[PDB]
Each structure stands twice: as C-alpha cells, then as structure tokens.
Ligand binder design. Structure first.
Ligand SMILES: CCCCCCCCCCCCCCCCCC(=O)OC[C@H](COP(=O)([O-])OCC(O)COP(=O)([O-])OC[C@@H](COC(=O)CCCCCCCCCCCCCCCCC)OC(=O)CCCCCCCCCCCCCCCCC)OC(=O)CCCCCCCCCCCCCCCCC
Ligand SMILES: CCCCCCCCCCCCCCCCCC(=O)OC[C@H](COP(=O)([O-])OCC(O)COP(=O)([O-])OC[C@@H](COC(=O)CCCCCCCCCCCCCCCCC)OC(=O)CCCCCCCCCCCCCCCCC)OC(=O)CCCCCCCCCCCCCCCCC
Ligand SMILES: CCCCCCCCCCCCCCCCCC(=O)OC[C@H](COP(=O)([O-])OCC(O)COP(=O)([O-])OC[C@@H](COC(=O)CCCCCCCCCCCCCCCCC)OC(=O)CCCCCCCCCCCCCCCCC)OC(=O)CCCCCCCCCCCCCCCCC
Ligand SMILES: CCCCCCCCCCCCCCCCCC(=O)OC[C@H](COP(=O)([O-])OCC(O)COP(=O)([O-])OC[C@@H](COC(=O)CCCCCCCCCCCCCCCCC)OC(=O)CCCCCCCCCCCCCCCCC)OC(=O)CCCCCCCCCCCCCCCCC
Ligand SMILES: CCCCCCCCCCCCCCCCCC(=O)OC[C@H](COP(=O)([O-])OCC[N+](C)(C)C)OC(=O)CCCCCCCCCCCCCCCCC
Ligand SMILES: [Cu+2]
Ligand SMILES: [Cu+2]
Ligand SMILES: [Mg+2]
Ligand SMILES: [Zn+2]
Lengths: 49, 89, 50, 115, 53, 57, 173, 57, 79, 157, 125, 105, 57, 183
C-alpha cells in the first residue's frame, strides 16, 4: 500500500507510470447532453460544436 | 513526442517536481497526448542479450481503388466465363 | 409529436407483410429491386415531362 | 390440474418454503452484518424446525387435494376434502409458531449482546 | 475511496511459485483414496526392452 | 423491519384463508364469498409484491 | 434502350402518366364487380408495382432532401455533430420533396392499358373517373387528348353533340 | 364494482413505479459505481448479487 | 362440445373425466368429447367468477345409447 | 371458353401406359433438384429452370458492369478527392477515432474507397438490372402456373 | 493498346495532390466564410504533414481562433437561412389553398356510432 | 393416412408417389387416392378385380359421406384436378378411382 | 346449418342483427367491394379461369 | 505423399494469412478504439514485457465467453419454425377473395395446422397403449378421423395396424366386415 502524499517529491514522481492519463473529454462544459444513438452510447463521449 | 513507453519513462525531466519548481503547467504538455503507440503489431522475443522488438506488419492501409479494380479483372472474367459456360452447358 | 401518423407506416409495410413465400407458387414473382430501378427511371421521365 | 390446489401446492412449496427458507438463510448468514450481534442458537433451531415442518405439513395435503379435484378460489368445498384441509391448516399454524420463534430469537439476540 | 480488484497484465505475470505443486493435489488425493495399488512384489519387472527405444 | 411488518400482515391474511378452509360450511367468513376472494387476492398481492420483493430487493 | 420494355410496370415517355395520389384516388372510386377478370388482373399487377413504388419514393427523394437540409443549415458539414438540426430539417423537407414526387405523374404501361383500353373495362374506368373525380378526369382528359387519344368521355371532343361537363382548358387544335 | 378492484389496479400501477425506481437505482449503481476490477466480471461477485442484477434486468 | 360464456370466463371442470373446458365470452370453442364408460361424474367451475363460484356444480351422466335414447325420447324430444 | 371432348375412363392398358409415363418422368428428376412430389412440381421445376437461366445472365452482366463501371465512372469520381473545394489538398477529418494516417495517402485513399466501393457496387447492380432480360420468366397474366402432369409430358407406346 | 488506358494508372491518382494556386490568387478583401475556410484548410493540411513543431503549434493556436470565427459565420448563415425557411413555409401555407375536400369515411363507423348489437351486448338469450 | 394400410407414405410405393403427384400438397384427397391404391393391390390386373376395386371405392365413398342410391352412378366427369377436395362423396369416389387407376401390380 | 354449427347462439344473434341491418337496406356485398383492386395477383386470378384446371383420370 | 504435404502447407498458409490480417486489425482496434475493442471481447494486445504498463488498458468484457449454446440454438430454431408457419402466413389473407378463396385459406391453414410430430404420436403408440387399450383406441381413432376433408388425418400413421407386442382382436390387417370399422 503506497499512501500518496500531497507533495511534489521525486518519490511521488516514481509512481508516475502507474496511472492512466486523465481523459480530458469530460472536462469543461458540454454543449451536448447525451447521444440518442443506441449503438454508440455509454462508450463514446458527446461531440462538441 | 514519444512513441515507446520505455523511451518515454526512461529520463523524463518534465516531472511534477521540476514543473512545480517553475509552477507553469501548460496545457499542451498533458500526459494524455505525450505517448502513443504505432498501431502496428510490436511484440518482444528474446534476442542474444536482451528483449528484441519485432514488428508484425501484414498489409498496407493506403490502397486506392485502381489497385482494387486491376486486381479484380481476372475474377470478373472468371465469373463471366463460368456463367456463359453454365448457359451453354 | 410525429406519433399519430402511424397509419401511413402500416399502409406502407403491411402490404409487404401480406406477400407470401416465393416457393409457395402463388404468383412466382419477386419484383422488388426491378421495380426500384424501373421506378427510378420512370421518375426521371416524369419529372422531366413535368 | 389447472386451476386446482395442485398448482397452489406447487407454487406454495416453491415460493413460501424455498424462497423464505433462503431468505432466512441469508438473515442468519448476515446476522452480525445486519444487527451487530451474534444470533442465539436455541430459538434459531426452534424457528428452523417449526418453519420447515409447517411448510411440509401445510403444503403436502394441498397436493393430495389437488389430485382429488379441488378448485383454487372456492371458500366452500365438497365434504370429502375437509380432512386434508384441516391438516393443511394445522401445518400453517405450525409455520406460525416458527415465525414466533424467529422474532423471539431476535429479542433473544439482544439480551445476549455478544460480539 | 473505492476498493480495488487489481487486474494483472499477462506479460508482467510471473510463474507460479507459491506452493505451485499443490494446485491439483487435492483432486489427485481424492482419486487415490479409493484406488488400490499393485504391490511391488506383484508388479512385473525387467520386462524386455522396446526394440526402437 | 418494514418487511417484517408486511410479512406479518401476509401471514395474517394466510391465517384468514386457512381458517375459512379449515372445514366446509365457511366457518370464518360465514357465507361471505366476496370477502374471502378479497382476502385471497390481498394475500397473493402483498406476499408477492410487498413481502418477498421488499425483503430481497 | 432498355431490355425490359415488355414489363408491365415499365413505360416510355409517351405513356399515360398518373401520379401516385391520382392512382390511389382513382382506386377509391371503382368496384371490382364491374370489371372483367382481365381488368382485375391489370389492377392487381398495378397494385404490386405501385406498392413497391410508394415504398421506394422516399428513398428516391432522400438525396435531394439531404442536400436541401444541408444548405439550410449553412456551409458547414458537422457530420455526426449536426445530426439533430440536419434531421429536423430533414423531417420537414423530405415530406416536401416527397410531395413534389407523389404529385408528379409517371408513365406506365399499366396506366395506359387501364385508362385507354377500348373494351368495356376501359370505358367503365374512364366514365367512373369522369363522374366521381371531375378534377382528376380534367387533367387526365387533357393528357389523353394531347396524346392523340380520341374517346367520347374526353372533354375535348369535337364530334360530340352534347356539351362538355367541365371547363375545356386552352389547347392547340 | 368500483372499489377494491380499482384499488388493486392502481396499487399495481404504483408498485410498477416503485419497481422502476428500484431497478433503475440498482442497475445504474452497478453500471457506474462498480469497483475498478469488478466492472464487468459477473463471476467475481457473490452469487446473490449476480442473481439480483439478472432479476433487475 | 361448443363452449361459450354469457358474461365472464368460467371453467367446466370434470375431475372424474380429467377434463376442463374454458368457457370464454365471444369464443365458440369446439372440443371433442368421448366417454368410454358408463358413468355419473360431478364437476365444478374452475375459474374465479364471483359470489357463487364455489356453488356452481355440474352433473354429467354418460349412459349406453339405449338408455340415452330412452332419456332423449322421454325428456328431450318433448322439449 | 369452349370445352373439349371428355374421353371415356381409361382401360387397363391405358392405365398401364399412364403409369409407365409417370415413372419414366419420375426417373428424369436430377437428385440435386429438391422438389417434392406434388401437382405443381413440374411447373415449379420449369419455373426454376427459367429462373436459373435468368440468374446466370444477371451475374454475367453484373460482372461485366463492374468492368464497365471501373474506368468510366468510379475512377473519375475518385479524381474529386485530390483537393477540397478550397483548393487545399485532401486531409483527414476525424469523426471520433483519431486514427494515425501515417502512410502516404492513407486518409485520401481510404475516403475515396469508402465513397467509391458502394458507388461501384451500386452502378454495377444498376447495369445488371438494366441490361439483363427477364422476359423468359415474366408472365403478366400468370398463365404459366397451370398444372402439368408427368404422363402428359411423355408418350409411351 | 487496351492496357495503356485500362491498366496504366494515371499519375494523379497515385501522388499527393498539390496546392491549387488558382484559388488563392484573387481573394476578396473580406474576412468572409470562404477566406476563413481557406485559411483553416491551409493550416490543417500543414499541421497534418509538417515535421516542424514550432510552426505546427502556432498553426494550432491560429486554427482554434479560426474555428471560433467560422462558428460565428456559420451562426449568421444558420440564422438567416432558417428564418427565411420558416417565413417562407408560413407564407406558403398562408397563400396555399389547403384541400379540405378529402374523404371523411374514416371518421364514420355506423356499426359503432349506433351500436348494431344493441340490447344484446349485455348477456341476453 | 389414418384410414390407409401403411404407417408412412413411403411404404405405399409407386402408387402413393403418383397419388402425391396427382394433387397439391395441401389437398386431403391424396389420402383417399391412397385408399384406391389399397383397394387395387391384387385386383387391378384381374379383369373382374378392377370392377371389384371400383365397387370398393363406391362403398368407401358411401360410408364416408351420406349418399343417395343413384348419386354415384350419374357422375358426368370422373376426371380429377389438383384442387379437388374430398368435400363430397363424388369427390371421394373420384379420388379413390384415380388411386385405383395408378396401382401397378 | 354449417353457420349454426360454427357459431354459438350469442354470436349467431349478433350476426343476425347485422343480417337484418343489411337486408333492410338490400346491401349486397358486391355493391361496395373494391378490395380486389388492392390485392396481390395470384395464379388463381387468371382471366381464363376455366382453362387453368388440368383434369386427369 | 508430397502432394498431400503441399496441400497441408497451403491450408496452413491460408489459415495463418487470415489469422495475421485479423490480428493486425484487432491490434489497431485496441490501440486506436479502446472501447470498441473491449466491447467486442478483444484482449489487451500490447506487449508490455519491457515492464511499463500500457497507458490505456481495460478489463476484459467477456460477454459471450456448451449446454447454454445448444439450448439457445434449439429454442431459436423452434421459434423460427413457429414464426415461419404460424405468424407470417397469418397476414397473407385478410380480405374475402373472389377466386379460389377456400383453396388459399386451405393452403395457409395446412402449412400451420399439420405438423410432423402427429405421425409419431401414432407410429409408436405401443409406448403407453397396452394391447387391449390399443385395440379400443384403434377403433376410436378410426371413428374420430373418419372425416375425409382433414389434412391432419393425412400424414398420420395408419390405425389399420396390429399391436407390435401382441394383437388380440385383429387377425389380419384388412379383414373387416365394415370399411370404417376395424372389426
Ligand atoms: C476460421 C477459419 C479461418 C481460415 C479460413 C480460410 C481462409 C480465409 C481467408 C483467406 C485469406 O487469404 O485471407 C487473408 C486476407 C488478407 O489478405 P492477405 O493475403 O493477408 O494480404 C497479403 C498482403 O498483406 C496484401 O497487402 P497489400 O497492402 O500489399 O495489398 C493490398 C491489400 C490490402 O489488404 C487488404 O485489403 C486486406 C484486408 C483484410 O488488398 C488486397 O490485396 C485485397 C484486395 C485485392 C483486390 C480485389 C480482389 C478481388 C475481389 C473480388 C472480386 C471483385 C468483387 O484476410 C481477409 O480476407 C480477412 C482478414 C480479417 C478481416 C477483419 C476480421 C475482424
Ligand atoms: C467491391 C468488393 C470487393 C472489394 C475488394 C477489396 C477489399 C479490401 C479493400 C481495402 C481494405 C483496407 O484495408 O482498406 C484500408 C483501411 C484503412 O482504414 P484506416 O485508415 O485504418 O481507418 C480506420 C477505420 O477502418 C476507419 O473506418 P470508418 O469508421 O471510417 O468506416 C467504417 C469502415 C468499415 O469497413 C470495414 O469494416 C470493411 C468493409 O468502412 C465502411 O463502413 C465503408 C462503407 C460505408 C461508407 C460510408 C461513406 C459513403 C456513403 C455513400 C456511398 C454511396 C455513393 C455516394 C455518391 C455521392 C455522390 C456522387 O483498412 C481498414 O479499414 C481495415 C479493415 C479492412 C477490411 C477488412 C475486411
Ligand atoms: C426506427 C426507424 C425506422 C422505422 C421508421 C421510423 C419513422 C419515424 C418518423 C418520425 C420521426 C421523424 C424524425 C424526427 C426528428 C429527428 C430528430 C433528430 O435529431 O434525429 C436524429 C437523432 C440523432 O442525433 P444523436 O443521437 O445525437 O446523434 C448521435 C451520433 O452523432 C450519431 O449516431 P448514429 O450515427 O448512430 O445515428 C443516430 C441516429 C441518426 O438519426 C437518424 O438517422 C434519424 C432516424 C429517425 C429518428 C427517429 C425514429 C423514431 C424514434 C422513436 O440513428 C438512430 O438513432 C437509429 C436510426 O436521432 C434521434 O433523435 C433518434 C432517437 C431514437 C433513437 C433510437 C431509435 C430506435
Ligand atoms: C427495402 C425492403 C425490401 C424491398 C424488396 C423486397 C424484398 C426482396 C424481394 C426479392 C428481390 C430479388 O431477389 O429480386 C431479384 C430476383 C432474381 O435476381 P437474379 O438476377 O436472378 O439474381 C439472383 C441472386 O441470387 C440475387 O440477386 P439480387 O439482385 O437480389 O442481389 C444482388 C444485388 C442486391 O441488390 C440490393 O440489395 C438492392 C439494393 C438497393 C435497393 C434497396 C431497396 C430494395 O446486388 C448486390 O448485392 C450488390 C450490392 C448492392 C448494393 C449497393 C450499395 C453498396 C452496398 C455495399 C457497401 C459496402 C460493403 C462493404 C464492401 O428477380 C427476379 O426473380 C425477377 C422476376 C423473375 C420472375 C418473374 C415471374 C413472372 C410470373 C411467372 C409465372 C410462372
Ligand atoms: C415498428 C414499425 C412498424 C411498421 C409497420 C408494420 C405493420 O405493418 O404493422 C401492422 C401489423 C399488424 O397488421 P394488422 O393491421 O393486420 O393487425 C392485425 C391485428 N390483429 C392481429 C389483432 C387482428 O403489425 C404487426 O404485425 C406488429 C407491429 C409491430 C412490430 C414491431
Ligand atoms: Cu363460474
Ligand atoms: Cu367460477
Ligand atoms: Mg383458468
Ligand atoms: Zn467506440
């Protein structure tokens, strides 16, 4: 169990490769509520204008 | 810009420690975009000293229609010949 | 709001529903795609005449 | 056997007996998770014995009546059924006694107050 | 904080060495409890060698 | 606990059903067939939808 | 031209042209008891050809409706992203293009055989359209007279001793 | 007649609404808030939970 | 047997013959009926119908054709 | 709609000749043609033969159509994917998947193929339906559904 | 013979297309949709085929700005075209003489309007 | 084929095959035709056996449906077609006779 | 007698009410029938109906 | 011999060409479209033998992953058989027909009413009918299937048969005193 701390030590940067990069698609504000297509739903993110 | 994870993680100087020493976290330096594989099969065998990276590439993806049409002429002529042969016999 | 227009939907597809199996030999006709292309040409002719 | 007490016996054995016995199995299996104390064995054994016996005694005579042509939703029936019906009712009351023991054990589980 | 069930990458697995020799043990021992074995006094021995081996 | 109360309710309805069927001649409802049918319907509905379904789900 | 000129559901330019709306309205004013078994056969063949045709017409009009709906949104193609506006405008415009198509007469051999046949079935159909569908017969009579058809039921009949039953639109004698 | 039967019909409507709420809540709880290793593996969960999710579907 | 019902669904249920015919409104259901013995069978209604669902009894007497003909000429023909 | 003279019921010799004709016609059915014994069977078989004939022609034309639709339509159509309407050469516009178009003209060639293969097949199908002839099987009045019996096909003795 | 113009593929179908210089010579003195689209296409093609990262990132910023400006131009186009379409629709149906002479048989059911089975719907025999 | 002699139509032989070929596959007349094949087993070749088989067909038709004494003796046309269904004793008789005609040996 | 056999007396009474309603007005079905114009063609719909049948001893 | 070896090698070559083209497609799908790869049941296909885990990996969604397949196939075949002859043919005739209406209705009904199982229901009647019960049910069946216009009586094994174990009433198959009675 590695108890990560709220710091910028080189020890924390050692575990930089054990995390998926954070997806930016859901960040910000969305101009589309949800896709009405059943084939591409809950897997694809909403498009933006 | 990285293609291989072992090159990406070998010696990285844009780590949070250094970037916090400067405290300027640019958007273009997101780790979501830093590394991306080649979409061509690449597996590992055991070489003479260490792991050897072997790439399995089978077919190209940039084929245009003229190649498909020229490679189909014998098949179309075979279809025509077989149908006419069936009609005659 | 488009819901109460279903009688047209039945009017189009029920006629497809009442087509028997081909090898029952009631008429021995399968005229789907033939009519598709023939009516494409016929609509070209009709629009040009109009 | 349609719309007769054979169907009633079938689905009552299934639903009442099996489903409620499995529910009680889960209740005793998760007694510490649900109540924070361990259950008492005496009234639990009494609950098990009486509930199971009541289920059998109450729903086997219903099979007997279903084989003899007893419709489902009639409150009056031919005289030749009463015998088994009485036995069936007896079984139900046995079941009820088991239910009592169930609640008793819960009370008995909080006098005990063990980890 | 959610609990975790860690998935292991197949490429990063290691050969089983935590008492690996016991995975089938129970199964075999359930089959050999009701098995009668021929004593070595009765098992034929020094049989002729296979010509090609 | 709500399911305990509803299960007691269903057990009471089943007790009414079994007391009407203890012997012929309608000893419980005394000739009122409609009340018996209401009791049977209520027993089935609250045992299925308001005892077992609440408990489990 | 085509290798299937024999087909009853086919036609050339100078065949009798009836729109689908006209065809259905004409069907609404006829009785099967008054038709010979040959006329019933013509009507049944026309029925199957026309059911396939009415099924297919929206498919014919879809490219034009798609283009018009795209041009109404603007000069930006937001594929998979402007689908909502595109298909609202489509559900509006495709009915209009289908209106233009379904009100457009199309020629057919069955159309020219049902109307212009010289037997009793043709006369029955012509008179039934003449009386129960005066406007449809007005258009159809103009078309038939323009195509060198000479029937008593036509409004443009110079050999008749009875006055026409409708307004005779101007035409070249 | 108007009475108990209408009570039963409208109570069944209400029970349908309650079941809708329940299955929506629990199905979305599984489909969204599952732990990182138990998102799709039916077998890993205890059998009562697999049964509950199947019955909710 | 052409089974039908005036108002609601009933069930002509003969346990001795092991048969049950559902009398459904608006449904003229045709059933074949064969009794291979001389027998007086009682029966009931096996579909919930109301107040007298319990007291809706049935009596069917299958007789040899001579006795059936005697009943038919004596009690059936005079209407 | 007149009527023909009804012959008297056949004698034993005529019945035997009819049986011989029926069995001889039965022997002629190929084992790979699975038509059951029925009144319309022969008629169906005839229909099937004609249908198969048409099928062959169609496919030939279809193949021919592909050839004729190769250089005449689809390749000149693919000449339209070289540049955009703004004059800038073709570049990849991704919908959802940001595929890496690393190869030379992967984006342009793939888009051209996506809009050309359906066009190729559609034009070939149109050519096949336009140029093949269905006249042999077409029956406007449905007069070819009449029952033909095996003994009527073959004359014996 | 036949292979010369049937098998010998044309040069243009193989190599990458070059820039059409005719379409960038005489440009209108406007920041209109055409010019903005031309700039956007130029920068997108460049960043799709350029090994130089500084120019690529400059073009990325300029492409975001052009995306915003083209969104504004498209909003104007959408407003004008759709308002014109709605007004034309309303005016057409204002001047169009709607056919109200359709058959009304569908609304009439004489067996149901006056129940033909009267006094027999309730069980009586 | 509850009224015929064989468990399945394939045991009937060539006569049952000809009966199947005589009528459309949904026509119940085939079974009656099959009964003809049963009546003319050892009788078709005998000159009086054929008459006996025809009489057997007449009796069979009279037993299946109510018939009148002259009704089966005044039939104008004994020929059958594919859509001839055994709705009348005349049709039953015609199907049975057609089955008798097709019984070689 | 066939119609009486196929129908119960209730449905027979309904159909007799319809028959009275249609016989008072003398409504022959051929006066209104047009659905044959919107029915698919069949081999049985040939103009020469008498010659479609093949007769064989 | 050598030709057989060449055929075997060619078959292996074809199989492996298909396999490796498919594997290239699957690897590209996993790298570029991770959610569709998971939905289709594709394993994480990136070789991480160098020790650095992949930046976008996922848990296997093995929805499809013997008896279940067999029983689903049997039920689906039964349902397709039912819809083939019971549902769809219901819509063929919906209006009164001028020509051969009874013929067309008979066709629709025959392709639905008469099923194959019925023949077996009497072809192996000894599996529950004793000799005397078989004789009585034989006379009963001959009476009940007396009506000629019944396509279900056709395609049903004959009642003019002796009991396989022993036959008491019937001495010969076709020695009767009445045509429509087995005695
Ligand atoms: C379970 C049983 C499995 C085994 C069954 C038996 C074998 C079946 C498959 C046979 C076979 O050879 O398949 C290989 C074949 C790939 O071809 P290949 O021989 O490996 O290619 C050799 C070079 O790589 C070629 O690479 P290249 O880029 O140099 O050449 C271009 C290439 C580019 O590659 C592809 O297009 C491959 C696409 C896959 O395209 C072609 O060569 C094909 C098109 C040629 C023109 C059209 C030919 C006539 C068409 C028919 C007539 C006209 C209509 O794979 C498939 O057909 C399917 C692959 C999987 C698809 C996705 C599945 C998920
Ligand atoms: C003709 C018959 C014989 C053909 C013989 C040759 C067959 C092989 C051809 C070449 C295959 C190949 O490897 O191409 C490179 C191509 C390279 O693609 P990429 O750059 O990796 O793009 C990633 C996705 O595949 C990108 O996929 P995506 O999401 O962009 O598209 C899905 C993909 C899915 O395709 C497949 O899965 C393969 C099939 O394609 C389609 O669905 C194509 C059909 C739909 C086209 C829709 C657009 C046009 C609509 C209108 C057409 C009508 C005419 C309009 C006229 C306008 C007015 C004149 O390879 C693949 O796509 C891999 C699968 C290859 C085939 C496996 C079987
Ligand atoms: C059931 C259809 C066939 C029978 C005939 C039905 C006739 C209905 C007539 C009444 C409705 C007329 C149109 C009303 C206005 C449509 C408004 C609209 O924005 O529609 C497009 C809109 C697509 O927008 P989106 O889902 O945000 O696009 C997601 C992706 O970008 C793109 O996702 P994608 O590429 O997968 O395509 C999404 C969508 C593309 O939409 C269409 O192709 C429109 C098709 C008609 C939609 C309404 C059908 C009735 C729904 C109830 O396609 C579908 O939803 C399936 C087709 O689709 C719907 O609103 C469909 C809602 C129902 C979905 C489930 C259908 C089962
Ligand atoms: C919409 C709902 C359905 C509407 C239609 C009703 C359902 C179908 C009914 C049957 C249609 C049919 O099979 O017609 C052909 C049928 C026989 O066709 P065939 O030429 O013998 O060919 C036989 C083949 O097995 C079959 O030949 P085929 O022509 O049926 O099938 C081939 C044809 C199929 O064509 C279609 O499916 C048509 C599609 C467009 C129309 C869609 C709406 C219809 O073409 C293709 O498959 C090539 C591709 C076509 C689509 C092109 C677009 C791109 C697709 C690919 C995208 C990329 C994929 C990856 C690469 O026509 C006839 O039998 C004519 C009548 C002859 C008898 C007359 C008797 C008169 C009375 C006699 C008394 C005695
Ligand atoms: C959903 C799209 C439906 C498209 C139209 C289908 C159709 O014709 O339905 C009418 C047909 C019904 O045809 P119908 O109008 O003859 O209705 C028969 C009604 N009964 C059986 C009660 C007498 O609909 C169906 O068969 C099912 C429709 C839903 C399918 C999903
Ligand atoms: Cu009752
Ligand atoms: Cu009742
Ligand atoms: Mg019931
Ligand atoms: Zn996806």
């Amino acid at each position: 169990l590695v108890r990560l701390r709220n710091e910028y030590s080189p020890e924390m940067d050692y575990y930089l490769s054990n995390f998926h990069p954070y997806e930016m698609q859901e960040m910000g504000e969305s101009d589309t509520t949800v896709l009405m297509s059943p084939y591409k739903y809950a897997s694809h993110y909403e498009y933006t204008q | 810009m990285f293609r291989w994870l072992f090159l990406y993680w070998y010696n990285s100087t844009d780590t949070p420690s250094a970037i916090a020493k400067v405290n300027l976290w640019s958007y273009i330096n997101l780790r979501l975009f830093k590394a991306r594989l080649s979409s061509s099969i690449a597996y590992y065998i055991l070489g003479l000293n260490n792991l050897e990276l072997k790439k399995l590439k089978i077919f190209y993806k940039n084929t245009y229609f003229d190649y498909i049409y020229l490679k189909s002429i014998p098949c179309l002529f075979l279809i025509i010949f077989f149908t006419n042969l069936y009609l005659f016999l | 709001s488009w819901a109460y227009m279903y009688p047209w939907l039945k009017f189009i597809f029920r006629k497809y529903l009442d087509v028997p199996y081909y090898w029952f030999y009631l008429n021995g006709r399968e005229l789907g795609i033939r009519v598709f292309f023939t009516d494409l040409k016929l609509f070209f002719y009709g629009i040009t005449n109009r | 056997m349609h719309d007769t007490f054979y169907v009633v016996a079938h689905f009552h054995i299934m639903l009442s007996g099996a489903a409620m016995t499995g529910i009680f199995s889960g209740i005793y299996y998760y007694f510490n998770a649900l109540f924070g104390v361990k259950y008492s064995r005496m009234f639990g054994y009494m609950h098990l014995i009486y509930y199971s016996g009541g289920q059998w005694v109450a729903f086997v005579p219903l099979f007997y009546l279903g084989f003899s042509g007893m419709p489902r939703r009639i409150h009056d029936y031919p005289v030749v059924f009463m015998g088994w019906h009485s036995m069936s009712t007896t079984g139900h009351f046995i079941t009820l006694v088991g239910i009592i023991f169930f609640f008793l054990m819960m009370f008995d589980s909080h006098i005990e107050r063990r980890a | 904080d959610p609990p975790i069930k860690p998935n292991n990458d197949f490429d990063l697995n290691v050969p089983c060495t935590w008492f690996e020799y016991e995975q089938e043990w129970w199964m075999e021992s359930c089959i050999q409890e009701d098995q009668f074995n021929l004593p070595e006094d009765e098992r034929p021995y020094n049989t002729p060698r296979n010509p090609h081996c | 606990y709500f399911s305990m109360v509803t299960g007691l309710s269903g057990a009471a309805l089943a007790t009414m059903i079994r007391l009407e069927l203890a012997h012929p001649g309608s000893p419980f409802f005394k000739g009122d067939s409609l009340r018996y049918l209401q009791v049977v319907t209520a027993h089935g509905l609250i045992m299925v939808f308001f005892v077992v379904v609440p408990i489990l789900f | 031209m085509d290798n299937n000129y024999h087909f009853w559901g086919n036609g050339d330019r100078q065949d009798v042209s009836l729109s689908y709306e006209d065809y259905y309205s004409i069907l609404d004013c006829l009785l099967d008891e008054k038709l010979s078994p040959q006329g019933l056969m013509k009507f049944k063949n026309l029925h199957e050809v026309s059911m396939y045709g009415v099924s297919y017409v929206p498919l014919y009009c879809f490219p034009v409706a798609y283009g018009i709906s795209h041009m109404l949104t603007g000069k930006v193609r937001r594929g998979h992203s402007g689908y909502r506006n595109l298909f609202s405008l489509m559900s509006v415009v495709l009915p209009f293009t289908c209106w233009y198509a379904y009100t457009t007469p199309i020629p057919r051999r069955l159309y020219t055989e049902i109307i212009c046949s010289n037997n009793a079935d043709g006369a029955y159909v012509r008179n039934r359209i003449k009386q129960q569908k005066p406007g449809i017969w007005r258009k159809l009579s103009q078309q038939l007279y323009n195509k060198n058809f000479r029937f008593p039921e036509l409004n443009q009949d110079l050999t008749a001793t009875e006055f026409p039953l409708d307004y005779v639109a101007p035409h070249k004698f | 007649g108007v009475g108990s039967q209408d009570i039963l019909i409208l109570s069944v409507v209400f029970a349908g609404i309650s079941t809708t709420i329940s299955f929506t809540n629990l199905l979305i709880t599984r489909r969204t808030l599952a732990m990182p290793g138990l998102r799709h593996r039916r077998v890993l969960m205890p059998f009562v939970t697999i049964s509950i999710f199947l019955t909710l579907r | 047997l052409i089974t039908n019902s005036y108002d609601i669904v009933h069930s002509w249920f003969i346990p001795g013959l092991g048969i049950k015919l559902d009398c459904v409104p608006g449904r003229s259901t045709h059933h074949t009926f064969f009794i291979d013995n001389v027998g007086f069978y009682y029966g009931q209604c096996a579909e919930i119908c109301g107040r007298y669902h319990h007291h809706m009894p049935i009596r069917v007497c299958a007789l040899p054709f001579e006795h059936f003909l005697l009943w038919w000429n004596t009690f059936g023909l005079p209407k | 709609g007149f009527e023909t003279v009804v012959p008297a019921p056949p004698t034993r010799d005529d019945e035997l000749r009819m049986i011989k004709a029926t069995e001889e016609q039965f022997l002629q059915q190929p084992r790979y043609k699975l038509y059951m014994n029925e009144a319309h069977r022969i008629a169906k078989m005839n229909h099937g033969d004609r249908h198969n004939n048409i099928r062959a022609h169609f496919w030939s034309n279809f193949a021919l159509g592909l050839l004729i639709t190769g250089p005449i339509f689809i390749i000149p159509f693919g000449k339209a994917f070289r540049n955009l309407r703004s004059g800038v050469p073709y570049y990849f516009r991704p919908k959802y998947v940001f595929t890496q178009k690393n190869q030379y003209n992967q984006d342009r060639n793939w888009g051209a193929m996506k809009k050309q293969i359906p066009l190729w097949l559609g034009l070939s199908t149109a050519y096949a339906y336009w140029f093949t002839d269905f006249s042999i099987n077409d029956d406007e009045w449905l007069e070819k559904g009449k029952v033909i019996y095996p003994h009527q096909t073959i004359k014996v003795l | 013979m036949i292979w010369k113009y049937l098998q010998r593929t044309n040069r243009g179908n193989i190599i990458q297309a070059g820039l059409q210089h005719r379409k960038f010579e005489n440009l209108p003195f406007k920041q209109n949709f055409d010019n903005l689209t031309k700039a956007y296409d130029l920068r997108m093609w460049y960043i799709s085929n350029s090994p130089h990262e500084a120019k690529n990132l400059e073009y990325v910023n300029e492409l975001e700005a052009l995306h915003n400006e083209l969104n504004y131009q498209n909003s104007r186009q959408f407003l004008f075209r759709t308002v014109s379409f709605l007004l034309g629709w309303a005016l057409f149906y204002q001047f169009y003489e709607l056919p109200k002479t359709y058959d009304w048989q569908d609304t009439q059911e004489p067996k149901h309007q006056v129940p033909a089975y009267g006094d027999l719907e309730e069980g009586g025999d | 084929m509850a009224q015929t002699a064989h468990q399945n139509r394939y045991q009937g032989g060539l006569c049952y095959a000809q009966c199947n070929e005589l009528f459309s596959f949904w026509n119940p007349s085939i079974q009656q035709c099959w009964k003809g094949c049963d009546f003319g087993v050892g009788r078709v070749n005998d000159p009086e056996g054929r008459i006996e088989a025809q009489q057997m067909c007449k009796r069979w038709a009279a037993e299946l449906y109510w018939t009148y004494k002259g009704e089966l003796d005044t039939i104008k046309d004994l020929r059958v077609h594919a859509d001839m269904y055994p709705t009348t004793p005349q049709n039953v008789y015609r199907a049975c006779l057609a089955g008798v005609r097709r019984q070689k040996f | 007698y066939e119609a009486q056999y196929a129908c119960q007396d209730d449905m027979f009474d309904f159909l007799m009410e319809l028959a009275y309603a249609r016989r008072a007005a003398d409504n022959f079905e051929s006066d209104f029938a047009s659905h044959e114009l919107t029915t698919l063609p069949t081999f049985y719909d040939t103009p020469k109906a008498a010659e479609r049948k093949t007769y064989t001893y | 011999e050598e030709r057989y070896d060449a055929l075997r090698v060619q078959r292996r070559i074809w199989s492996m060409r298909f396999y490796y083209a498919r594997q290239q497609c699957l690897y590209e799908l996993f790298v570029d479209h991770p959610d569709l790869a998971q939905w289709t049941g594709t394993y994480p296909k990136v070789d991480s033998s160098h020790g650095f885990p992949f930046y976008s990996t996922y848990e296997m969604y093995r929805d499809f992953q013997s008896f279940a397949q067999w029983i689903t196939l049997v039920c689906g075949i039964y349902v397709i058989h039912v819809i083939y002859n019971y549902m769809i043919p219901y819509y063929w005739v919906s209006t009164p027909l001028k020509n051969d209406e009874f013929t067309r209705l008979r066709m629709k009904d025959y392709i639905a009413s008469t099923v194959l199982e019925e023949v077996y229901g009497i072809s192996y009647a000894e599996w529950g009918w004793l000799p005397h019960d078989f004789a009585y049910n034989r006379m009963r069946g001959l009476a009940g299937y007396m009506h000629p216009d019944d396509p279900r009586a056709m395609c049903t094994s004959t009642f003019h048969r002796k009991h396989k174990y022993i036959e008491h009433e019937v001495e010969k198959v076709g020695d009767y005193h009445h045509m429509t009675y087995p005695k």
